[PDB]
Symmetry: D2
């Protein structure tokens, strides 16, 4: 096991433009606090519109025809991404420590989940750089028609606080492998791993201006990015409300292309013929992983009437044994909730459950008067019209609903405006394939949960997003198609 770094000193706190470190134009700074201790970690430069303008101009200059970045052969862009993945692997303990300091997630989770995802995503997209191919199209005997899959240009990336470095790498890996340049804005709550990655980008050998990073607030830096007349594309991960604002500002300004990865109201469907212990364990991790603060969280667990009581009973036994505490401690599986606004949000919904007719089975309150920890809560007798089944709790609350037929559970699972993920538990071939085809979700897991791969696309149907991240499909978000049609005389 890797050794925890409980007293790490943050070295990168400035704006990264043209492979150099800058103070904010205004001189302003903001603090980042550790969610576990509530103490301040350091001050970071606070970017605003003038810093975004400087970053966008550097990105435009690095993308211009004839630039060192544009002149690189396709395989050399792949080599640079592999060199960046080598550095991320070398500095893995430090990156995971900065992520634990900023988010409060357990060190071993940051090391084995977040950082593993970063390295695998970088290596996967490094291999696509010389494999981005257009088409030769047959038309007429005297015509040569073909398509070029060109880089779009300057790409803005806006990410959230729950998986800071990972959500940034899901955009940076395909963007760079396609030949674009970038302006990144990490969440104000979690700027540290992004700034450290800036140092590795320069060390890997990327030409100045290919990646620029401006820390700051959403309505200031984020809005300057979404409305910028010289940013050609934006990729956003975060809340549905902010995703709508970003896509609106992008449309209002220069019609820049927009990828959105938003929340969900993700269902779990457990059939009577499932391996019940597998379904209980997967639905447990689905609800309680990352303190419930994950876009993939299960918000509705639909269980067939035949196994309903036994599923509730075994779920209650699993929720009580979860170790909660200090993130840097090896035994810890659940750290604190990011902030007071999140901790109070989760606490307010549990009361509505008991008042609407649902039976509280376990938990239902905060852990202790010291940190932002909440007790794993399970609810039975949940119905569709209830608040705990209609709203994204983003906390450790497991609502268990009952169903009788496949057709009925398909209608209920799809009765939401969201569609990010779904998980089905059954040993039956026909039920598994029928549910996988019928569920309106970007990813359908069968007999598993949270099984992500750099090679498999991920994203939402309906209001859970626009576009896909990961897989070959991610490349379509970072390229522009040009048709060249030549008529021979």
């Amino acid at each position: 096991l890797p050794r925890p770094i409980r007293n790490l000193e943050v070295k990168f706190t400035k704006i990264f433009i043209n492979n150099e470190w800058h103070e904010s134009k205004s001189g302003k700074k903001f603090a980042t606090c550790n969610p576990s201790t509530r103490e301040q970690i350091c001050e970071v430069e606070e970017g605003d519109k003038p810093d975004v303008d400087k970053a966008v101009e550097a990105a435009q200059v690095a993308f211009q025809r004839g630039s060192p970045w544009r002149r690189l052969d396709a395989l050399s862009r792949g080599r640079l991404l592999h060199q960046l993945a080598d550095l991320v692997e070398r500095d893995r303990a430090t990156l995971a420590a900065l992520e634990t300091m900023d988010t409060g997630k357990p060190f071993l989770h940051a090391f084995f989940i977040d950082l593993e995802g970063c390295i695998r995503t970088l290596r996967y997209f490094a291999g696509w750089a010389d494999k981005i191919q257009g088409k030769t199209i047959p038309t007429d005997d005297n015509v040569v028609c073909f398509t070029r899959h060109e880089p779009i240009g300057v790409c803005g990336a806006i990410t959230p606080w729950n998986f800071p470095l990972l959500m940034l790498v899901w955009k940076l890996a395909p963007a760079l492998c396609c030949g674009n340049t970038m302006v990144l804005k990490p969440a104000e709550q979690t700027p540290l791993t992004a700034l450290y990655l800036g140092s590795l980008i320069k060390e890997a050998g990327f030409p100045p201006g290919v990646v620029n990073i401006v820390p700051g607030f959403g309505p200031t830096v984020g809005a300057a990015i979404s409305s910028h007349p010289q940013i050609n594309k934006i990729a956003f991960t975060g809340s549905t409300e902010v995703g709508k604002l970003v896509k609106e500002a992008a449309s209002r300004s220069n019609l820049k292309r927009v990828t959105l990865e938003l929340g969900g109201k993700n269902p779990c469907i457990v059939c009577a013929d499932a391996d019940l212990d597998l379904a209980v364990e997967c639905a447990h991790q689905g609800v309680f992983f990352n303190q419930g603060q994950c876009c993939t969280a299960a918000s509705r667990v639909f269980v067939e009437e035949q196994v309903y009581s036994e599923f509730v009973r075994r779920s209650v036994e699993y929720a009580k044994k979860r170790p909660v505490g200090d993130p840097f401690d090896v035994k810890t599986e659940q750290g604190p909730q990011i902030d007071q606004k999140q901790f109070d949000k989760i606490l307010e919904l549990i009361e509505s459950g008991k008042k609407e007719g649902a039976k509280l089975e376990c938990g239902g309150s905060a852990m202790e008067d010291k940190g932002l920890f909440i007790k794993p809560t399970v609810f039975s007798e949940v119905t569709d019209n209830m608040r705990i089944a209609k709203e994204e709790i983003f906390g450790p609350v497991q609502p268990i609903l009952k169903f009788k037929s496949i057709e009925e559970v398909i209608k209920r699972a799809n009765s939401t405006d969201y569609g990010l993920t779904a998980a089905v538990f059954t040993k039956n071939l026909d039920k598994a394939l029928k549910l996988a085809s019928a569920l309106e979700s970007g990813t359908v897991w069968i007999n598993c949960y949270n099984a992500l791969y750099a090679q498999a696309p991920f994203g939402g149907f309906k209001m859970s997003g626009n576009g896909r991240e990961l897989g070959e499909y991610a490349l379509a978000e970072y390229t522009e198609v040009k048709t060249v049609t030549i008529k021979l005389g």
Copy 2:
């Protein structure tokens, strides 16, 4: 040559929902007028939000799982599209006459160009129905991972007045070949061919509610479609200003996926080593086709200094010989402009050209003071700062600019916020390929103009659009990617 139908009676004027004809909920109607005779053709039902709600509900019912449309095997949707193409071919003369009546374009142009494009586009996408394939993705030894390219659902289509049936078919062909259902809104100026197509959809055997058509105005029907919470996707062709409104309404409502095909400020670059006579004929047709009312029209004809004077001279001869008149006459190459608003706007730009210093070579005024005809106009000595070089004229005006170097003409050609098409005329291999690569345009034509194929994608860079129409690329706009990941026990 097909005989001109100079006195056709219009049979289809109503709202088309569930394969039936309906009066508008308000009882209101709007007139459609022939721009050549300036007489009213007929009155069409004027839809509003209640009519759109009824059409979306029909499209939703036709799309629900288990419906006749959803149960059709892939090859059967292709058969339906070929049966529609056969009906469009059978009624080709009537559709072309309806298009000439509504738009003023010559009857032989609507017959051999617009209608040929419709038939070719329907047959091309009919062949894609059983060829839309997802992927099987290698992951781990105990995992089966694959993607499904599912239909998105209810698709809205909003089209302009310059190529009414064709812009509609460009959306309808891929949408239906992917298994979607639709709500169509033709332009208020040109509703006739869309309504006639509705009668062909019912005769072709499409189940009720697969295609619904609501004629009406933009801020009423169009805005009800763009903001609808049960429309999953919208494809829009029209002005950049309205495209922005549609995309903002889409983001604000339900994050429906959006395709935009907007205007351009398209450059046509004529090098000194070009086949000069081919470049003159192509740039002439490229400016003057469809009365200059084409999104592909050359807004800037850049000619190298070495051939500038002879290019201008030969272009004037072409412009002076272009037969302008009654669109139903066999000799007519140019009919009237669409309406008074467009006619006055073109005349305003012609006066601005004179007042800013451009040399008027020919035309420069209306034909015979009464009709909506404008004399084919050529301006030489045009510079980049002039209005006739910056603004999309959408009329029969050819502005000829001079250039000296390839690097300079690339900079000038790309200095626009648009990027729909570009054309290059040169006999040199290196010049042609360097220009094809450097021009920021969705289609680059070399030694040809307006060379479109159902199999070659078309769309804009920058503010000329998002997404592509035609080719295999059109399918990505009408399908939603689903990852199914199965872990074997």
Copy 3:
């Protein structure tokens, strides 16, 4: 139901070259007999090496650059294949009658199976003609690299007697959609449907020489095709022994490319959790369809010990109720075996079963002293080392083997040098996917049998073949890849 044509007169009996009908150069003819009556149907021209040379020269002239066939736009080749499918549909009753006359298969089977497959294959490949796309490959900043998927040239097609027209269309549809020209050789036992198709090829409008047909014997016409120095590719369907000879002669002569579709020793695997009645019915059709004379025939039915006796019992009940008789009679599900050599081959293997320890359950002898009919036979207690489990019977004999575990049945099912098809029956998701991944077969059917689609590839692993027919994969057999690499100065 379509009316049978019990007294049809054959009109096409000559060699088809350059869209004209020719006598053989030698003047020789051969007879074709009806397998049901044993009577002679007609005499057909007997081609030899001089007729093949004439056919190959016509095919070469039709394929030369600048020819009408080579000049056709991609979409027009698709239109020709659709016109040929329209004619095949129009003349469906006549084609099915000629196939029943030549093969002895029931008229309704020829009409609803063979002819349906022909029409679907033609329509599917008609849609690929304008969708055969190569790639644009990223290399260096100063290089333009792309691939062309060109037609190979003159394609020879050699087919067998069991599905005459269908096996020919599986080659002709992709070959023509890719732009090649052809020399066809149907089996000497079944020349009629191929010659009738020649008349429809000319009527559809294919230029002369694009398709040429030379009836005759294998060692004469077939060998002249496989060894021809001006045939660029051959596709062969038939016995493994003849497939090896064709591939050897192709290699010895000019290294022409070869696709082979050969026999199999196809397994059926029925798990204890299968829908037993579905498994019994599918394995019945698998063994007894087309009198057992099908490349997809099940030669080994592996049944899990838990359902073994019940599977044998229900299989015996199904085999006794099969209606055998006159092919043109509506109630007939089984006609006669093609010839005496086939009828005697099936009769000799049943004796070996009883002598090696297998229990005969039903049948085991000829039907009656009048025609070439054999009684549906079922064997239980079959082992791997027995002759009825090791040899392709090509007749109505169902050997039922017993198994205990999945790992064991995978090893046994794969212990053959063949690998054409396999079928698995189970309600369990994991067993279905594990068996589908582990079985070394070109097609794995799950809970079905003989489910072919024009869009799904078909072909063998190991000695069951080389290459694939059907699906997008068929196009790779009929195209040659050319890389064009251009360096810009």
Copy 4:
């Protein structure tokens, strides 16, 4: 520049099976000699059929389901290939010195050309391992149809003496990225780099038996591989005559799939409008690279009459200045020929050129009567009927032919039974594209020569080969297509 290793000791001389070194079963050894010093380098174990049987059994065991190699996740096979490339880069100087010792090619050519190709090819295919994707195919509403691109199994590789390590890596890289196991046979003249690669395969961490190497002769080891009943695929690079033998042995044994990369009679077409100095330099390197012992060598340099005399003149100056000598010297551009047999064959062709009427411009004899060096030879006034224009010389001889029209040079260039490569030199767009389309060659270079990329396929038309190496196309040669069709109840 890397320092030349003039006195390297060879460590690896044994048969490599299961990551261990073995003496031959017979105890026999064969010598390898340095063509520059004409002294023996070392003795290598001489394999025969017993050694091949042991290597195939190891490859089969390494390929069986459940083996460590088969259980590796897709991304892990890519990591192994990158680790092998890192080891080839680390030992680049030693591999290049071993290649120079065995072949006589200049040390800097083996270092910057052969070894660079090896590393680039390994890294390109390492990136394909997690990107080999099959398809999900739409069929019927109740059917799930998909393809898997499975590894073929045991692959044999037989390579020639002119680019020993590179031709091996071209097969090894895609074979292992697809999950296959291998038996390799390097040429008897050049076994050293293949055996050194074996030590790198074991050090890289490949499980035992994934790669096995059996040095030896063609009719013994090579024929045992081509005829082996447990080898599923063979890739061969070498002469057309031996390729025919291998393909016939493959057909006669088990129908193993075959790839052939054979010789060519490659045309190099220089138009009057070419950049003459570029065409002279390219055609010079294209004939003389690797002592003229390249499959890509121009066998016919066709020059348009307008520039014929000046082309000949400038080519003579290049040929006279080419430094011939000790391959380890930095200035050397041409080493000795491979052996006495090749050396005498080249001298025989040079005499035949003189006796048939070609004008000897320079060279025409051995360098200094003792060594295997031949003076760079240029012949003008060459005609199509001459031996030096029909036969693959495989030596430093440039035959320059004259042409007058494009149509005539297309006919003459395509009149061969071969079709590996072609090169065209012209500044005209139409001429370049018309020639690229009309030349029957697997690779057509325009204004360049020997421009190979790991991402661009390479292979022959006609008798120059079957299949492609490099690019995405290489994967189709190392995978077997499986259709899985599931019918839902």
